[PDB]
Design a protein around this ligand. Sequence first.
Ligand SMILES: Cc1cccc(CCN2CCC(C(=O)c3ccc(NS(C)(=O)=O)cc3)CC2)n1
Lengths: 210, 210, 210, 210
Amino acid sequence: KAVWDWLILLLVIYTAVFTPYSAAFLLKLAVVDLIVDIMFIVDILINFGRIAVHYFKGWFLIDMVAAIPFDLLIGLLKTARLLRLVRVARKLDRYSEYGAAVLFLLMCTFALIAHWLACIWYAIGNMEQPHRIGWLHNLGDQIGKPYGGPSIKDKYVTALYFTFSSLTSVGFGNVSPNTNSEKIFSICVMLIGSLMYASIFGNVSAIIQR
Amino acid sequence: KAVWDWLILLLVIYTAVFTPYSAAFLLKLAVVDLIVDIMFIVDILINFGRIAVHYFKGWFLIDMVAAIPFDLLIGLLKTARLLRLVRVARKLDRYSEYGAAVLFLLMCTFALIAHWLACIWYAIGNMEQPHRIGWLHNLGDQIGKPYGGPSIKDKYVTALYFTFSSLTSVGFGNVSPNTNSEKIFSICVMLIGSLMYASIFGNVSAIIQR
Amino acid sequence: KAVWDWLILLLVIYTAVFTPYSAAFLLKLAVVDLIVDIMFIVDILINFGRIAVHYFKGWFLIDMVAAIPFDLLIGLLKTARLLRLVRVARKLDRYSEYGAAVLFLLMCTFALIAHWLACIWYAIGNMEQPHRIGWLHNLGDQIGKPYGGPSIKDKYVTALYFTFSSLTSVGFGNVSPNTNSEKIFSICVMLIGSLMYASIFGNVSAIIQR
Amino acid sequence: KAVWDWLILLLVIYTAVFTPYSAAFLLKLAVVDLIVDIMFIVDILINFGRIAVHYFKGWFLIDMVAAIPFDLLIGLLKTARLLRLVRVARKLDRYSEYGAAVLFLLMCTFALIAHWLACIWYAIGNMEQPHRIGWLHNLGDQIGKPYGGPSIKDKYVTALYFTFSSLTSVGFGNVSPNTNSEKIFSICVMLIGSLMYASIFGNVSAIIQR
Ligand SMILES: Cc1cccc(CCN2CCC(C(=O)c3ccc(NS(C)(=O)=O)cc3)CC2)n1
């Protein structure tokens, strides 16, 4: 139990990294998914004898709905496993004792927001690709693989790099929104990044000043 | 009356959004504008026998100027409705108790400043267009609609996206000033955005701690 | 003498604005500059028997060397008039009483640094006359006036706009250094702008609350 | 004694500047670094009979490994002289006594981080070059030196300018990543730049008001 919470935090990080990635990119390893589901089942079993009634009124419903496999496009239902983040949200008391832990958690949240926005950006680009104006076509032209098209690794790296540059307000000019949906998404990302800097990069300075 | 105050704030936000838009874009529904005008007349009616003399020498002239209809250019004279913003600026104390409502108001005023600057940017672009130089011609080339050029949706979205990038200091490089009026406007927006952005988001970071 | 300090401040701002501009751009009105020099001579005269030795011991040398006419590329010596800028520094005792005055003065210093860096940037870009390389040739190509070349208005506005984009860290994309001297100057501008952003726009965030 | 270790700080800055530059750009004079290592041998002799065992227990081995000559990948082993900054890290009491000294040291470490990132960026670009995609090819085609190729001066200046623009979040658009390795390096540099820029310049803004 002493190291169970940090293992669950790592598990939540893994699923937060690889669930939106699998939804956006790979939908078009399984054994690791089965292993992590088994570990979360073990966790919920441990969570349970006069206190089980308290758990039932508490977070039992959310953990149960996030732990039940949905196998019977059914692949979009796997998003429900993103509900495991409530475990980290509710156990913040233990995850706020060390300064290095707080720094690592802040970078984890920053990288996760960038990753989720990258998945959304690729979703938009791939939705609009079939119907020379989108960012995917320009990327393929500028990396020497005209639309075939860029490999999945190239698309993910470009999406993450664009999202990081927009969040950090560098705006490299390599990747620029050109369609109305891309422009509106970029406006939303600019607003999100403004709020995220005002919070996170003030907190980081304040707790480095410690 | 508190519900009435919040309703008046909502209508003031609506007019601050839709009268500069109509002045900049739509010149060359209205029933909602008429309804809002009737609601504002209702507000100036409920505003009022002992206190009537007190208010008559107060803001009443300002409210009257922003309430009279100029339906005898009429379109540019209809911009007098922007004076209703004092109806919100004069009782901001009623909008400073929730704490998070102040954050919402700061986000709203940042978005409103961006929208007004977008309308000014489009006004400059349209006043220069008839005379490959200019943001409208470049936008028409990029978007795939060479100059009748881009639709009003594309023009407004591009203007708002450019203004947001300039205020947030991203500088995407998709749209960039190229004419002397555009360059001077961009210098003014750079100064104004630095000053505002710094003030607004310093306040936002301050209220995040609470 | 009650309002003489503010008038002298306006004259100092004028000379700071217009001496580097004449040194860089116009070298290739006189009456206003002559009137300003006469007014500065009047200023040193009026503020001059027990206290004469006090002035002789103090700022007499700097005030004198910044007031003697240089008439006899000899106009390059007129840049010594920038030593009059120390008068606002030594009268910051009174110029700092009002918060609005402090904010206006901070914006003035920011704009003056941008203007001086614009003059230096144009000077650097104009040293490369003997040599599609350099910001002046790119500027001429962009605005449809290939080298003739752009007018002095276009050159000054473009230099000021590039300097403002660099200092604020927007980097619009039209103007970008392409020569080792330009790149090194841009690195220096980035260092100076980081130093001033840490100073000017932290002090502004402190001042606004005050 | 203070003059001695301030000279040692200057020597440490010299070697931190000139070790990665020689390791990366000149992999294809020795009197200065011979003098520097002789001076550091003199320093290790000064550092040492009662206290000799005290130093032997402590920093003796760290200072010895960074001072032993490596003459006998063979030329790459000289990067071990980059453990010498522990000399200035271990004695921050003197170096941080003055506020102006801390300001100068913060500027120096920011410039050093930019220099190291420039060396890494050039190493990546050079390892990718012999395989219009790389940044070196674009630099050569934009500077007027088609790939021969740009001189070492041009390559170093361009790398340093790109690194400074990325750290300061300008993103000029002249140099932008176009390969997966370059994009990953840029993402990591954006995270690093956010952290170091925020920490360093929060410290700077704390210092200036003092
Ligand atoms: C990082 C980040 C994420 C989201 C929003 C903003 C907006 C506020 N955010 C403050 C730091 C600024 C900054 O880092 C900077 C400003 C001016 C500079 N001028 S200069 C000549 O390049 O040194 C350099 C850096 C950039 C804007 N930010």
